[PDB]
Amino acid sequence: ARKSCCLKYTKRPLPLKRIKSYTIQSNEACNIKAIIFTTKKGRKICANPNEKWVQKAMKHLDKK
Template sequence: MSLVSITLISIVFLSLLPHTPKAYGPLNYACCVKYTRTPLPFGVIAGFIEQSSLEVCRIDAIIFITQKNKKICASIEDQWVRAALAHLRSKIAKLENKASLRLTTAGPNSVIQTNTTNSP
């Protein structure tokens, strides 16, 4: 076989191999490229993710995830976005407080001592 034949066969064979996606970064990562200006009702928001322009994507954004797993891009500069984030953070804080209360509450077999002295 000639060198040209071997080269052509090698090129065809290598082009049939699947390319490694790790070499190109996370291909399934979708970046926000524009914002919605329409406020979302708070009841449809299930959570959020922060997108930073310092990472893979070009703009800073808040990505709201709806209860139907739809992703909505919004700007942190919008008042409705800041209000929604504040509401979500307060819900998280309440859940964390409830969880810590459950951890510190005495169980059914615990003895709770109280001060029963009467003050004049």
């Protein structure tokens, strides 16, 4: 239990309107690079940084 890293990415894209913020997982410290999204429910979601929706999300979440 307790994993600060993700080794998977979500197969289901999230709506940005439901995301509060993210965390940058480095491929340096973790096996892969997976941005950890956190929803308004505060749930942790591992998303693929390579995903175009994640680019939009990241830029929007990086704003605040």
